[PDB]
Amino acid sequence: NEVGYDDIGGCRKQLAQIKEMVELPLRHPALFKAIGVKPPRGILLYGPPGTGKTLIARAVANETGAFFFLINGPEIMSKLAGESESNLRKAFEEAEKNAPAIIFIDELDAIAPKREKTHGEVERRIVSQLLTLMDGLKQRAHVIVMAATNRPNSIDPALRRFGRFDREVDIGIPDATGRLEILQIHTKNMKLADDVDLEQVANETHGHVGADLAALCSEAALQAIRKKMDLIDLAEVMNSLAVTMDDFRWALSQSNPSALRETVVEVPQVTWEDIGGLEDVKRELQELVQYPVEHPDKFLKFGMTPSKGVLFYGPPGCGKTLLAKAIANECQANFISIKGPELLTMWFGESEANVREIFDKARQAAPCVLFFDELDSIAKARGGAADRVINQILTEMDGMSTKKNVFIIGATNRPDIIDPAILRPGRLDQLIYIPLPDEKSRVAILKANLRKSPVAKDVDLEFLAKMTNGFSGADLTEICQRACKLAIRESIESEIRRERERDPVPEIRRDHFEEAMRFARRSVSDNDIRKYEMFAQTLQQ
Amino acid sequence: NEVGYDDIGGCRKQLAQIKEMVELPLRHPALFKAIGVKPPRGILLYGPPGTGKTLIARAVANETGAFFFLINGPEIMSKLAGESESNLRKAFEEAEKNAPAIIFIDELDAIAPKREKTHGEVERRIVSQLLTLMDGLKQRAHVIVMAATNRPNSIDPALRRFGRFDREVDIGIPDATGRLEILQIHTKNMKLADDVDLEQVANETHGHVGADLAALCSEAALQAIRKKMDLIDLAEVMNSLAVTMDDFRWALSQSNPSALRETVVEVPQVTWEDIGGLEDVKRELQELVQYPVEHPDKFLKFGMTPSKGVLFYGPPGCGKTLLAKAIANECQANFISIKGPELLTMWFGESEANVREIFDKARQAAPCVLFFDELDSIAKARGGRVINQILTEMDGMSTKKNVFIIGATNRPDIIDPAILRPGRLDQLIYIPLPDEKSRVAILKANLRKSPVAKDVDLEFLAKMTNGFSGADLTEICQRACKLAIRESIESEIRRERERDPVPEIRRDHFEEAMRFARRSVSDNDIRKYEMFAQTLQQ
């Protein structure tokens, strides 16, 4: 036993939560009379698999100094019939006499799956044996258990019956800083050529696993092996560990992550400078999520509970999406975004428990903001009514208190045919129309265009911002892509003349901007803007 | 064994009923030749898990003084195959050898689910052995068996056949004062700092259960442990039992609700001051609700037992919802609200069979009034199933045992051609757009749970909103509250920026919120409701 905190760390919030929730037998054995009962009587761990949850349990039992005693879960499935209760009853009786015991089983879906998966008799008998051993461990000298599950829907809800397995602590995936921590710890073994800071690697990667970052580190060292020709039993590499930034980018091009397409949960990094204008609107969207978190006395002063979200109907654009990202960044709260295709999956695909799973993820990862987009798509597809999604949405938000403040940010192209029921109070009625973005917002968009972009003189960004009033900010990012395409068309094409004969000029100029402002279009028409301003008739009841 | 009867509470009506039904072994065993048969044979216990039904059975066995012997159902499933009759016939013969015996079986659905879900043979061997034991206890010296079930439909319907396990006592989840009672129990063992009276913690923790309140009272002390920097094995962490209201609202902020999104059954604390006006309407509603319950002599005078509910149509407003809550408050009856998304869930999604269980919970929860909302949304979603079982279940409901069905409807024409027929809910009632006295009651609801002072002209806003809605006037009240809070943030930001809360909304905030409201009803929308005032001289 040689593990530590930092090995599979990075997820500092969840590891700090499990630090606060597990340390109660550590140094405080008689405190259970003061607290009344231990909140750990079994701790469930759902997430994308293989994220070092087993090493998380090993690390927390190392820091408590308790008898860890890992039991491999599918070994019970690997035992023969009639003796499958061995190494579980024996393990629990071993942990009964050893009072500092933090039990960790793993792959509980092998042991205790969904009720549809429980065909056969020995599997449900193993399930019953484990849960009866668990509630037999009532207090029983401060012994707890930990599990390793995919998601709570895939396991037996009889184990999720409370009084046992009541703690759900959602390790999930790390952020760019957490992936930087995992990448730094896994590169403690190796040595790099210092041509990369590895924050660009951890920021560039998306949806990976800590074991997948171990695979990236292994493939970078493998590329260091692959570059050199086969030395005759040589330690010429063992003193010259020289993995490069080229090795890391080629490893990133090769690797296929596993936790891809799972819904991300963590706070994003926008820091409010992408957006501009709508100062009372941005103050309102700041306050509705921040002051429930930062000033509970102010909503304790007046007990009238504010709404738990908005509806950003308006023109199609990424400004509402980046605004909703920066809201959770400035609140420093978690963020889950469920866009249009995922909403269409419940109507085309017909799995309406997914809405329950998304809101359960939102509740379990509180404080959080649920961003929703393209909500009219399931209704405009019907046109050319709620249809299993919107009624599910109203079902979940009705069962949603102001405590565990899940925030619901909608985004809609057309407010006419979305839902009559969302306009009523008690539901989510905040018709915050963000307009087509004006000149200050487009200057902020141009400032965001400078991010990860070498910039110099000669560019007339103010002239383009003055011309493109009707062109939206998402469309201004589109013409930034067009000008980038025109620059990339001629950058290395300039120096390929040198190689054809035998400077990169890494700056976009104004002629590329003029060609890009010739080529494109605009993503709005005025006959949509008039029905956007149709809601300005809201004067008097 | 240390649990007293007063240790568990909350469900006062349910605990009174189960003390009424279990006490027949207690002190009067010779009463069985007077009553003929013992009315408990098997008592079924449904409800969400974590409500302390094991504690309830232990406490009722402790006040009875009977041989309890609780067994948990999955321990039978934990045993080896072919010897699983251990702790089943052994347990029932152990209860046979001791006459005051109250068997409690925890998690019956792990033993006896529905029979088609009992794939394989040994599950129904165990279920058959248990039920043959159940009717093998014919009288057998006053033994009865209780069983912790999750839901009545989830267990085998053969197991609830009249003769074994036919007493349903519908424990359910507790109400707000029941939550206060369980909170007082869980804070009896510990001590707080008395900044909160624990009513203000318990009157909003909706959808929570006794295990949830145990989690609240545990994590409040955990927050108190989190408050100190470090105590190195010393008794300052034990004597300073000083958890705060901030710790309790933080604990509710870190509370995962177990039995939320469930049909709640509580008495709703409205007390009639929310809605005024409509003297004839309120007279006939308290007539048709309370007087069948509290005056059965006048309804045994004559035989025309009236309708089992009414229909409310007109504009979409919260006044009829709080009205339906307040009538059940005034009769002190239970209340289950069936909402629009709940009714729309079954029709597009094919969940129709749970209507048979919602009406079953209604029938168990009698006397009660059922509120139904937005029933035309299923009707208006035809152009862009479930209601045919509401039209079956109330038709299969007796003239007594009130389960009164209150409907909420936008368009009164499109709902149902059969509900206006007598025998069904033929009492069409147009609850109108809210008028001046109703809006005064809306202002009374606005100043309810609100800090108040002078510079208020709520009557001036009432006269500005003369022929206009009151639910949108409540929306005006949250808009003015939102205006007052954001200017009540800037009052204290100068003290923190340079280095009073003003807890009353002023009149300029209300007159600014006047400009951010819309007519919810239209004049032709009023006219198509008022066309149904055609019921006149024949």
Author numbering:
A (entry chain F): 199 to 432, 439 to 588, 596 to 713, 726 to 764
B (entry chain A): 199 to 432, 439 to 588, 599 to 713, 726 to 764
From the paper:
Human p97/VCP (valosin-containing protein) belongs to the type II AAA+ (ATPase Associated with various cellular Activities) protein family, which has two AAA+ ATPase domains. p97 comprises an N-terminal domain (NTD), two ATPase domains, D1 and D2, containing conserved Walker A and B motifs, and an unstructured C-terminal tail. IBMPFD/ALS is a genetic disorder caused by a single amino acid mutation on the p97 ATPase, promoting ATPase activity and cofactor dysregulation.
To analyze the activity of mutated p97, we first assembled an in vitro complex of full-length p97R155H with p47 in the absence of nucleotides (molar ratio of p97R155H hexamer:p47 monomer 1:10). Local resolution estimation showed that the density of the p97R155H dodecamer or the p97R155H-p47 complex is well resolved in D1 and D2 domains but not the NTDs. The densities of D1 and D2 rings were invariable across the reconstructions. Four NTD densities could be assigned and shown in up configurations, and they are rendered into slightly different orientations in the azimuthal direction along the C6 pseudo-symmetrical axis. Only one p47UBX domain was found to fit into the density attached to the up NTD. Unlike the p97WT-p47 complex, the mutant NTD may be too disordered or mobile to present a structural feature with the p47 factor to be resolved by cryo-EM.
